[PDB]
Amino acid sequence: EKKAVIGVVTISDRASKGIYEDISGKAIIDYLKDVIITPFEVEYRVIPDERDLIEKTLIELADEKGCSLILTTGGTGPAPRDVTPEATEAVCEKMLPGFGELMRQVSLKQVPTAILSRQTAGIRGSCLIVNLPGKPQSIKVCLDAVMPAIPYCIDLIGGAYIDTDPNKVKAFRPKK
Amino acid sequence: KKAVIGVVTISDRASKGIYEDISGKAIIDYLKDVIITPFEVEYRVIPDERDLIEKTLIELADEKGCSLILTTGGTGPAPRDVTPEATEAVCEKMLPGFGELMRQVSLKQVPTAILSRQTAGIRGSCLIVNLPGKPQSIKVCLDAVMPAIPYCIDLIGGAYIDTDPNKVKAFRPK
Amino acid sequence: KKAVIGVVTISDRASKGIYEDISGKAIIDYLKDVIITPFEVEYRVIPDERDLIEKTLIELADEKGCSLILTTGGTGPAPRDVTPEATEAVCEKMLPGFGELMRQVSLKQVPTAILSRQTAGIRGSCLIVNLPGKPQSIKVCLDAVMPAIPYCIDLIGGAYIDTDPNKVKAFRP
Numbered sequence: 001e002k003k004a005v006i007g008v009v010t011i012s013d014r015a016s017k018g019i020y021e022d023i024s025g026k027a028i029i030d031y032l033k034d035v036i037i038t039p040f041e042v043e044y045r046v047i048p049d050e051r052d053l054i055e056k057t058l059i060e061l062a063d064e065k066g067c068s069l070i071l072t073t074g075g076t077g078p079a080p081r082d083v084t085p086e087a088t089e090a091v092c093e094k095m096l097p098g099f100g101e102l103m104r105q106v107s108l109k110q111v112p113t114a115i116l117s118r119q120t121a122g123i124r125g126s127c128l129i130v131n132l133p134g135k136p137q138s139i140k141v142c143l144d145a146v147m148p149a150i151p152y153c154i155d156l157i158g159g160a161y162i163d164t165d166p167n168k169v170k171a172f173r174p175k176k
Numbered sequence: 177k178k179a180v181i182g183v184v185t186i187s188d189r190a191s192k193g194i195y196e197d198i199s200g201k202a203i204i205d206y207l208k209d210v211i212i213t214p215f216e217v218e219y220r221v222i223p224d225e226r227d228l229i230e231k232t233l234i235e236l237a238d239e240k241g242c243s244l245i246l247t248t249g250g251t252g253p254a255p256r257d258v259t260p261e262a263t264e265a266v267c268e269k270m271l272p273g274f275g276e277l278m279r280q281v282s283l284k285q286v287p288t289a290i291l292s293r294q295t296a297g298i299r300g301s302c303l304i305v306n307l308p309g310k311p312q313s314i315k316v317c318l319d320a321v322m323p324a325i326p327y328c329i330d331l332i333g334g335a336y337i338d339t340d341p342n343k344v345k346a347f348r349p350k
Numbered sequence: 351k352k353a354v355i356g357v358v359t360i361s362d363r364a365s366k367g368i369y370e371d372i373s374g375k376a377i378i379d380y381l382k383d384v385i386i387t388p389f390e391v392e393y394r395v396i397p398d399e400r401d402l403i404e405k406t407l408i409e410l411a412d413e414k415g416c417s418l419i420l421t422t423g424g425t426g427p428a429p430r431d432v433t434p435e436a437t438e439a440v441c442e443k444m445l446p447g448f449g450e451l452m453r454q455v456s457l458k459q460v461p462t463a464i465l466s467r468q469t470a471g472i473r474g475s476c477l478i479v480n481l482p483g484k485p486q487s488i489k490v491c492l493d494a495v496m497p498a499i500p501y502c503i504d505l506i507g508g509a510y511i512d513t514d515p516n517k518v519k520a521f522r523p
Contacts, residue, residue, distance in 0.1 A: 078445060078472055079505045096253060098279045098290030104447045105454075112497035112521035115447030116505070123253050135523075148287040156254045156291070172287035174310075271427060273453045273464030298427060323461035331428045331465070347461050 004040035004160035006032060007061035007070035009047065009054075011084050016048035024073040027136050031143050035164045043067060049075050054087035062091070062127040068159030069150060070129045073139065076119045084131055085118040092122025092129060096153075099130055103142040111138060121146075126158040148172045179215035179335035181207060182236040182245035186259050190223030197221060199248035202311035206318050210344045213337055218242060224250045229262035237266070237302035243334030244325065245304045248314065251294045260293040263304055267297030271328075274305055278317045286313060296321075301334040323347050353389035353509035355381060356410035356419035358396065358403075360433050365397045373422040376485030380492050384517040387510060392416055398424045403436035411440070411476035417508030418499060419478045422488065425468045434467040437478055441471025445502075448479060448495055455494045456487060475507040497521045
């Protein structure tokens with residue numbers, strides 16, 4: 001059986017040179033540990049806002065570390081240096097428009113500027129890559145919104161088996 | 177102009193063997209139930225081979241004169257699901273609102289609706305729309321987008337289609 | 351630094367002088383009504399010709415120094431409706447959330463909202479947003495996206511804009 005490996009990449013020129021506490025990264029890893037009940041390992045990376053480095057990082061995680069899921073945080077706004085979506089589009093062979101649409105929709109509730117987010121999601125081999133926001137409150141609503149479909153998506157692309165605690169988040173798996 | 181509607185079932189079972197087509201059935205049943213104007217159906221069941229999908233859509237729009245083509249199948253994240261790609265390839269103008277609405281109305285009952293890559297686009301005077309595969313989802317999606325289809329077809333110079341207002345209100349700013 | 355907003359009406363009728371532009375005027379009125387900071391308007395009424403749309407958007411952003419450009423017209427399914435195409439052609443980064451929300455908000459009124467291809471993108475320090483036609487559908491879309499515009503402009507190095515919190519709250523994290 002394939003081992004479940006999950007990538008968590010915090011993208012920020014600032015944090016890349018040092019960060020006392022990666023609140024965004026910690027929130028994401030905390031979430032995963034809480035809701036997931038199947039065995040899995042985390043591959044954490046903190047890199048700057050450099051398109052080529054982000055692409056190479058995602059590639060290393062998916063291709064070398066064998067991640068079935070990679071969650072990024074940061075670099076998805078309208079500013080010129082925010083190139084996480086561009087890097088994500090570049091390494092994936094197929095994008096999932098439903099992710100960005102839903103994440104912005106749930107984020108909009110409390111954040112009117114959620115429509116400025118260029119967060120997306122895509123598939124590279126047997127790995128799903130999802131761009132999350134930076135704010136803890138936004139990260140939470142986005143994960144609550146998309147996690148229910150992640151395990152099944154991973155099943156469909158041949159990734160590692162992941163299951164969640166139905167009491168926190170139920171991993172929807174449609175059957176024949 | 178004669179109203180011809182294409183219904184294309186794209187199967188990922190061409191090799192495993194097809195024993196039924198409940199998806200195509202749901203679509204044909206829907207069309208017959210709501211459309212009140214005369215129309216014919218060009219039905220195609222093809223394997224999920226990208227070039228064949230594009231070829232089929234081009235034939236239906238260009239040779240068979242369809243004003244609307246409805247597809248089912250091959251719209252998920254799996255690598256073999258390339259219906260959306262084929263659709264983009266044959267269309268000159270895409271309509272993002274279709275995929276958006278279809279994923280939105282399907283979300284409550286289908287959390288995995290965000291995995292769907294269904295889209296919609298225009299090729300000359302023909303509107304092409306990707307539909308899901310589950311009959312229940314097909315009806316839900318068609319109920320959401322059919323209201324704007326007849327009018328969209330008018331705007332691109334396609335054949336006249338009108339539905340039973342007691343079943344589906346084809347909105348026509350007129 | 352100076353706040354300049356472009357308002358582009360893409361219509362044949364209006365460009366011929368045989369139709370008053372109720373759309374563009376509604377946009378200008380909206381801006382004058384909600385903005386409380388100093389700004390000027392660069393108004394243009396042009397035919398729906400692909401090349402003229404791109405050149406007008408480029409003139410406004412590059413030569414007139416607009417930090418925001420609002421277009422109206424040519425965003426439907428018809429083959430002549432190429433405002434979105436022209437917008438994509440001049441922007442270096444698109445904003446999918448804008449089209450998503452505008453269609454969302456429009457669905458409330460009419461189901462044909464899904465036929466709209468309105469979008470938005472960035473060119474340098476200028477934000478370009480495609481608005482609807484009816485002066486009424488314009489107010490509705492603007493009420494939905496305006497809250498995030500001033501801040502977007504801040505992030506791309508554009509001019510400072512702020513609105514009347516009693517009319518439209520310009521959200522700034």
